[PDB]
């Protein structure tokens, strides 16, 4: 049994959403199904959920905010009627909650501003005698000036994990994001070993693949 | 039905014990509906515990719930690096006399040393592709260090640079249990071209004194 959340996007305040949970492997009349929410860097919040009989149940604070129903044999639908800037969070459908048959979805990413859309710019941070240490060189990349979250970043088309740091994006005065992503590699490899960051911007259609190499 | 956790943040040495409270404004369904759960960065929470004591399969025998009624804890014993997560409570309730679920606010899970560690810290020049675009970002990246504290300073021509600078820091490594930080200093191309020396100066209770790195532009 899985469970999978979509339709998380940015929109401006006061434009109303709809999120769909869809369910494999069982059946709705069987089971109870729950939302829950997380702001950045907050809490876990229930939202509502629909019962084995079909009867909704919501939080006293998400009553009239959000409208849970059964939209299909194999889908609930969450719609966010009026959304404000506090609405953006991840949001997590589950069967249960509670009990043994509790199954959690990864949760899709809701933002709410009148910020506009824009795609990253990717820079090299070039491994150099100033990023070496003991045998052990640093390079990585610099992901700037983007909107809305996510970005995703591998090393090598994901073949290189250990010793790689993505740092959490910070919000510039401008409005927009900007992250690091950084690997440590023996220094010995800088002139055999290729190293790609791989950047994925969703929201702006944006991908890129940047060789990171010494600085000449 | 509100759920308070104490304390909010929590600090274990590795083979401690760390004792996480969660008090129910009500009392729970059948007085054990209280489940426990764990979240580790970027993922979903997992379920470890429900009926306030029960484990979920295949979770370590390490955590122990316990409680019923209004006032539950959860017991991690022999704490291990990867115990780093933030914890919450969840109680549940009979739908028509109460809110069906609520979540405790959250219990951070840190794991703590005796021993520090310093940061290698490393500085990268902006890029020439940046350059062109008319902007200078500077980066300066403190890896793999304990405890958490540490002070960053940009100095360009050796002036205390305040207000044209951010940075970000790494949840704690689940297996080596230290921090990392990127500092990144922004200037436009016309003020980075003014100057000759940038540095960034490292303090933290690992290094004797401060350590910095540096490079001159251009050269």
């Known amino acids: 049994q899985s469970v999978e959340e979509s339709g998380g996007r940015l929109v401006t305040p006061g434009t109303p959403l709809t999120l769909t949970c869809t369910v494999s492997?069982?059946?709705?009349?069987?089971?109870?199904m729950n939302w829950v929410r997380q702001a950045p860097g907050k809490g876990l919040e229930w939202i509502g959920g629909?019962?084995?009989?079909?009867?909704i149940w919501y939080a006293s604070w998400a009553k009239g905010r959000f409208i849970i129903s059964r939209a299909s044999s194999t889908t609930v639908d969450l719609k966010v009627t009026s959304p404000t800037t506090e609405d953006t969070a991840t949001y997590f459908c589950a069967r249960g909650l509670y009990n043994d048959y509790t199954v959690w979805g990864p949760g899709t990413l809701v933002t709410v501003s009148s910020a506009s859309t824009k795609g990253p710019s990717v820079f090299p941070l070039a491994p150099s005698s100033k990023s070496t240490s003991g045998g052990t060189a640093a390079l990585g990349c610099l992901v700037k000036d983007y909107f809305p979250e996510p970005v995703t970043v591998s090393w090598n088309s994901g073949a290189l994990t250990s010793g790689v740091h993505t740092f959490p994006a910070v919000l510039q005065s401008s409005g927009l994001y900007s992250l690091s992503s950084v690997v440590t590699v023996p220094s010995s490899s800088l002139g055999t070993q290729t190293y790609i960051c791989n950047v994925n911007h969703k929201p702006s259609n944006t991908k890129v693949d940047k060789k990171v190499e010494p600085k000449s | 039905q509100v759920l308070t956790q104490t304390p909010s943040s929590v600090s274990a040495a590795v083979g401690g014990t760390v004792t996480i409270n969660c008090q129910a404004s009500?009392?729970?369904?059948?007085?054990?509906?209280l489940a426990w759960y764990q979240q580790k960065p970027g993922q979903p929470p997992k379920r470890l515990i429900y009926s306030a004591s029960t484990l979920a399969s295949g979770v370590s025998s390490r955590f122990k719930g316990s409680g019923s009624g209004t006032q539950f804890t959860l017991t991690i014993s022999d704490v291990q690096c990867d115990d780093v997560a933030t914890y919450y409570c969840?109680?549940?309730?009979?739908?028509?006399?109460?809110?069906?679920?609520?979540f405790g606010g959250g219990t951070k899970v840190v794991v703590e040393v005796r021993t520090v560690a310093a940061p290698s810290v490393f500085i990268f020049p902006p890029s020439d592709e940046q350059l062109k675009s008319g902007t200078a970002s500077v980066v300066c990246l403190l890896n793999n260090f304990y405890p958490r504290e540490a002070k960053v300073q940009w100095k360009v021509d050796n002036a205390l640079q305040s207000g044209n600078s951010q940075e970000s820091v790494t949840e704690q490594d689940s297996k080596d249990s230290t921090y990392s930080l990127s500092s990144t200093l922004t200037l436009s191309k016309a003020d980075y071209e003014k100057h000759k020396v940038y540095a960034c100066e490292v303090t933290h209770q690992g290094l004797s004194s401060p350590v910095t790195k540096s490079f001159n532009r251009g050269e």
């Open positions: 629909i019962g084995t009989s079909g009867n």
């Open positions: 969840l109680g549940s309730y009979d739908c028509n006399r109460a809110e069906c679920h609520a």
């Open positions: 492997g069982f059946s709705l009349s069987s089971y109870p």
């Open positions: 009500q009392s729970v369904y059948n007085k054990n509906y």
